[PDB]
Amino acid sequence: KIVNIGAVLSTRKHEQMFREAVNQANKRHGSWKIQLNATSVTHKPNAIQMALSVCEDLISSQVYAILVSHPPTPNDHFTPTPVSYTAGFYRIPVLGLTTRMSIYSDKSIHLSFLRTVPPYSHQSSVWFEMMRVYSWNHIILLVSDDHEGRAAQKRLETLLEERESKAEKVLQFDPGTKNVTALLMEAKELEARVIILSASEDDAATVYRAAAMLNMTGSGYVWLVGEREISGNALRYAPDGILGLQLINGKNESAHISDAVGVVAQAVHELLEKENITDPPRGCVGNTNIWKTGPLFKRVLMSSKYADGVTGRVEFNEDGDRKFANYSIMNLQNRKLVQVGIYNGTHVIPNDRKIIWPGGETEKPRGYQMSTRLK
């Protein structure tokens, strides 16, 4: 009764510390004599080299999951796509550290992807909750031509339609356009005065510069900014009045990995005690079958509940991602981040700090201004 799980990690010190962490977790809470075997591999930038290492280390060692961490450099993408694709042959579950892209959310592209970071779709839920608690009905949306942006727009539409409320219109941008001035003007020529930004960092910076040079930073113009659009050039080319969002305990690495490996060990024990388990082929060449425990892992993990994590109970959505994560509303005051609101599940907890708005006003504006220019 020995199970070996491979790990993909960036640096050697991380490998050693995570090996020690999983060895300690093998004895934390309730555990048996032999449950896990500690193995790890380095994060190789070369695709062929990393694929060969994965095949020669994990497949040939009877693994049930892949412990792949986030790329060391956030600037580069280095998306964990090849590992998920290789694990999709036998529906092998994988571990996502902070991969927040919506590409892995759908199961049509990635058959079995599991991550501990909530998707970008939760930004739509945050916006909906803020509108509900601040009485906002008419809202325009600015989404670029991206798969994640389209998914977020669909989530917003399906979350707002249940209250018999529909957005006025949604503008589509492109990754690289520099003449969005016409789109900004046609968005300004609207009844609503609340704008939501959800795009790449460079596009967000460009559109914010266009808004600043077109005098869109005035009073009564509430700006909503996503998680990824508050860094980079945003900290330099953005005045106060920004309603930013940030994940609580998100950038931390070891905070969630221990809980994830504990959940993996518990799932392995449950699978061992449930029924017969099929074993993966030893060599990487010679077998192209499909695991019979593939859907079984999803069935036993989606309904699994574990309160031993640092964030209380652990629950998974229909896409096998983190459910009910902790969010934090970010406000900018003289290029300084100020914490006011937090999210812990269908609740809002504002702090004593006043929420400022663009133009220097200290009162919440209204999005209903009738210009009386009825054609």
Binding site: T372, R373, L374, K375
Partner: protein, 50 residues
């Protein structure tokens, strides 16, 4: 699109509504001259008004 000078029956009601409801009306004329209903065009599976 030369400016014309149209008047009649509904103009008085429109002026009264504008006076009593903070409205600033801009009267325009139909470019087609028809009320507009469902019509069939290329890709006739589309119900768009004219």
């Amino acid at each position: 699109t030369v400016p014309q000078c149209c008047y009649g029956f509904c103009i008085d009601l429109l002026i009264k509504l504008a006076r009593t409801m903070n409205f600033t009306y801009e009267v325009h004329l139909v470019a087609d001259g028809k009320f507009g209903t469902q019509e069939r065009v290329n890709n006739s599976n589309k119900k768009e008004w004219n």
